[PDB]
Amino acid sequence: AQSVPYGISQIKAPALHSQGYTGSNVKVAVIDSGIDSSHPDLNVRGGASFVPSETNPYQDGSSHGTHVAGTIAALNNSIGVLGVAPSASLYAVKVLDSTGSGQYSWIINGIEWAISNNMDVINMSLGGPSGSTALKTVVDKAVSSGIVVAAAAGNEGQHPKEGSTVGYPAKYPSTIAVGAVNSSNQRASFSSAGSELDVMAPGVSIQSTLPGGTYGAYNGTCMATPHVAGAAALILSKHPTWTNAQVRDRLESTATYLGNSFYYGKGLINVQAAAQS
């Protein structure tokens, strides 16, 4: 039988499902370690690999991308779990190898592929502590092209530091930097913090799909980000004329305020309020 992970309800995606909106005809690129397209609870429409050593984007040796993809769009059926936008068109853009890491050059090619193929939403549950002009250039190009780009703020908050721990490309203003809360809306101890933080989404003990047709729970801002990417798909399936700037402003401005924005951004996303008309 099918379960609904708590994070799906926490952001109020079921309200849109009840309205008949599930992300249909919205193209979502999962820029990550591939997606196990053979998983019975996922429908991957297409993809591309830019990892020289692993040319098949539909095999996920890390499990990272598959877990991310399930939070976005695990199918509504008799098994497994349920994504935020279970009707979204999913695309596997492999830029990380089986270790869950990749080079900025592979990521850039993935982003360019997303632009060239008219993706509506980019999920980047990845990042690093060092910037790259080539990275910022391609990310901005994507956003100027109309793409909603959601990026994990990072998992470097656990040891209090002076200054921002928000990683790249979440640090860039053009991207939505997403931090992690638990089911009580408490910031996760590991969630990066900084002035570049935009919103929070569930990122603790997130049950989602894993390669081999199985399921499991992970922690990280990498798990919160697909909640926001999925929310963007729901919104766009209801408001297909909205710009990526409108979609972002709605997600941020209608978020549930949780306190100091340095740690919480605008707060927890509320896709019901974001998409209300």
Where along the sequence are the contacts to Ca ion (CB under 5 A)?
Answer: 2, 41, 74-75, 77, 80
Smallest gap from residue 73 Cβ to Ca ion (A): 10
Nearer to Ca ion, 80 or 211 (CB): 80
Nearer to Ca ion, 152 or 234 (CB): 234
Nearer to Ca ion, 70 or 202 (CB): 70
DSSP string, the chain: -----HHHHHTTHHHHHHTT-S-TT-EEEEEES---TT-TT--EEEEEE-BTTB--TT--SSSHHHHHHHHHH--SSSSS---SSTT-EEEEEE-S-TTS---HHHHHHHHHHHHHTT-SEEEE---BSS--HHHHHHHHHHHHTT-EEEEE--S--SS--SS--PPBTTTSTTSEEEEEE-TTSPBPTT---STT--EEEE-SSEEEEETTTEEEEE-SHHHHHHHHHHHHHHHHHH-TT--HHHHHHHHHHTSBP-S-HHHHTT-B--HHHHT--
Smallest gap from residue 214 Cβ to Ca ion (A): 13
Give the nearest residue (CB) to Ca ion.
Answer: 80
Nearer to Ca ion, 74 or 176 (CB): 74
Nearer to Ca ion, 78 or 260 (CB): 78
Smallest gap from residue 1 Cβ to Ca ion (A): 9
Give the residues across from 47 on adjacent strands: 92
Smallest gap from residue 3 Cβ to Ca ion (A): 8
Smallest gap from residue 29 Cβ to Ca ion (A): 21
Q: How many CB atoms lie within 10 A of CB 174?
A: 17
- CA dist 160 and 165 (Å) reads 9
CB 117 within 8 A of CB 89: no
Nearer to Ca ion, 15 or 79 (CB): 79
Smallest gap from residue 149 Cβ to Ca ion (A): 26
| Nearest CA-CA partner of 146 in 124, 122, 167 | 122
Smallest gap from residue 2 Cβ to Ca ion (A): 5
Nearer to Ca ion, 100 or 213 (CB): 213
Nearer to Ca ion, 42 or 193 (CB): 42
Smallest gap from residue 106 Cβ to Ca ion (A): 30
How, if at all, do strands 206-210 and 214-218 pair?
Answer: antiparallel
